[PDB]
Design a protein around this nucleic acid. Sequence first.
DNA 1: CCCACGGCCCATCACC
DNA 2: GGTGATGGGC
DNA 3: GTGGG
Length: 327
Amino acid sequence: PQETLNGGITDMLTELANFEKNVSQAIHKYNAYRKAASVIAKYPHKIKSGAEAKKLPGVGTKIAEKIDEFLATGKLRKLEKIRQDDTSSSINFLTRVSGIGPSAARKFVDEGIKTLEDLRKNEDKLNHHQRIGLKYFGDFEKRIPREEMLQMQDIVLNEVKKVDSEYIATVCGSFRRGAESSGDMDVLLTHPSFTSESQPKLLHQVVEQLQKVHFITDTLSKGETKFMGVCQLPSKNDEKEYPHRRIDIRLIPKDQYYCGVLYFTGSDIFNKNMRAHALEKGFTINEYTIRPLGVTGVAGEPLPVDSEKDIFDYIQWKYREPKDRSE
DNA sequence: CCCACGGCCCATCACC
DNA sequence: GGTGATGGGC
DNA sequence: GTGGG
Ligand SMILES: Nc1ccn([C@H]2C[C@H](O)[C@@H](COP(=O)(O)NP(=O)(O)OP(=O)(O)O)O2)c(=O)n1
Ligand SMILES: [Mg+2]
Ligand SMILES: [Mg+2]
Ligand code: NA
Ligand code: NA
């Protein structure tokens, strides 16, 4: 559906969702509003009343009332008021800095720190991640055109094979679903010597090499299985520099890999829909495995999975191209 | 009336 | 020094 | 906030 169908309503709900997460610290209300926004966004008609909306699953009494007020006035008094509130709107804004959550934003605003400028003035109170988030605030809210993702993929797959030609690397996420732009880059990594029944160097080696060729520029977090950091394409000398980008690299056991690829190729909406169907034939699927639910819900042993397809087979669904896993 | 609300790794805090 | 809890991200 | 035991 076109966004201008009910965009006014969904904008309202998303903004409400944001204030619940960031200011009220009510995560389940945040998800409630999002779910409501999502189901309304998929609704193929212009909503004329809150009662009409209430028919949709996830839209209840309170949101129905909010829709009525919005339809009658073009606004929400509560939303209008919290927008004007310096404290609440500053708290809500600072959470856009990667590394600053509802709690940190709260503490900052409590002690007079409300803007990016104030953050820049008080580096002493920021942790490593927050400093990076601050330094690349602008860049991190930029999307990544597919053409750059391709170039980023070229570098990653090249350098990974250079380190060890037995590595397997896959760019997942919205890129693998064929999106024409992405928020970040997700890389899944495996190696024939790393399975469930098993360096910590395997992830480190790759990260280090990507640093050596000046692709990776910063590190947010780095463990033995998960890396989160910043990367940047090289410039053309004449041409102006590319924005810095967020990149995640996950090292996964060889025998948990194609569950990982499925999960982290995702679409959140597809994952939960494929979750949904999986439990209905008595299967539970997470990022690691697919397990048969038992006569009680006895989730037993992981089944063998050597491809994305096997997982589709288990729950009698035909293989869906990542291109179509929007939902 | 009352509880659940897809999950987990890493950095850092709280506390012994 | 350490273990467990919490914040944050995705 | 919504849904359901
Ligand atoms: N908590 C999480 C985090 C990620 N995922 C899955 C679904 C996502 O499509 C996939 C990758 O996560 P993601 O990077 O945050 N989203 P994605 O790459 O699809 O789109 P972008 O907004 O980054 O362009 O992992 C998930 O199912 N639950
Ligand atoms: Mg992504
Ligand atoms: Mg990601
Ligand atoms: Na409803
Ligand atoms: Na943030």
